[PDB]
Design a binder for this molecule. Structure first.
Ligand SMILES: [Ca+2]
Ligand SMILES: [Ca+2]
Ligand SMILES: [Ca+2]
Ligand SMILES: [Ca+2]
Length: 277
């Protein structure tokens, strides 16, 4: 029942290990325990009652830290094989998938899956297009890799969908606007691609997998690339990003098609990871 904003970069007048938690019922952000390693461009996902902070840039990181909210403690888990900043992370069928990113130790099309029951990462099928700054979300039994930057030199509007049952990636319909550093979340049977960089974007596009179509929805007030996006209590929250490095937070209600500001974080954060637990 909280949104966690994990790491990022405070470029206001620092790569962050700090973590803030938002309670929608009180409209308040509070600091929790910080991660060991500072991470900007970090991917964050939730599995089996832990937040996982995957990769990022401190050195480009293959390390992964897990947070237990019941104890307010972080601990390292097994590292990925490939270092990845600008990585997208999502959870499907009991695995965390780390998708793409940049290995500054290559823009990556490789994908690694983590099983918490074995504490092991393995490679699965790679995407067709390398993607750093990619948004990843899960809907109807597929992982969608949305946008990003292929520097193997294009900002991408293309979108690939992964089926774990076949271990295959397939292209779906592309977004209208190319978006790197895009935030992606899922609500009411649609994938929302929020902000990013084409021009720093306040526009938002929604994908219906049943029709294979993207449509624009209401734009955010503030343009945000490097934005973190998560879903809680029937709203999409767009957290931080770079317009100014932002500590502001906007909430989208799909039933009204409106964005509004909520309480800002204490620390401005671009390249921030955001998950709900
Ligand atoms: Ca509550
Ligand atoms: Ca527990
Ligand atoms: Ca299992
Ligand atoms: Ca299936």
């Amino acid at each position: 029942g909280r949104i966690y904003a994990v790491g990022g970069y405070d470029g206001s007048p620092t790569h962050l290990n700090s973590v803030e938690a938002y309670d929608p019922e009180t409209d308040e952000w509070s600091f929790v325990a910080p991660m060991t390693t500072p991470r900007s461009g970090v991917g964050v996902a939730v599995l089996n009652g832990r937040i996982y902070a995957v990769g990022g840039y401190d050195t480009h990181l293959n390390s992964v830290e897990a947070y237990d909210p019941e104890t307010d403690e972080w601990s390292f888990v097994a590292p990925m094989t490939t270092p990845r900043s600008g990585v997208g992370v999502a959870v499907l069928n009991g695995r965390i998938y780390a998708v793409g990113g940049y290995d500054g130790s290559t823009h990556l099309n490789s994908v690694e899956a983590y099983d918490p029951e074995t504490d092991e990462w393995s490679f699965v099928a790679p995407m067709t297009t390398p993607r750093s700054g990619v948004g990843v979300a899960v809907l109807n039994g597929r992982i969608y890799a949305v946008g990003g930057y292929d520097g193997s030199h294009t900002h991408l509007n293309s979108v690939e969908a992964y089926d774990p049952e076949t271990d295959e990636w397939s292209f779906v319909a592309p977004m209208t606007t190319p978006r790197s550093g895009v935030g992606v979340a899922v609500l009411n049977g649609r994938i929302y691609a929020v902000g990013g960089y084409d021009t720093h974007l306040n526009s938002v596009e929604a994908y219906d997998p049943e029709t294979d179509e993207w449509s624009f929805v209401a734009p955010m007030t503030t343009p945000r690339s490097g934005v973190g996006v998560a879903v809680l209590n029937g709203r999409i929250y767009a957290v931080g990003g770079y317009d100014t490095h932002l500590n502001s937070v906007e909430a989208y209600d799909p039933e009204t098609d409106e964005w509004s500001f909520v309480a800002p974080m204490t620390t401005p954060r671009s390249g921030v990871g955001v998950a709900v637990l």
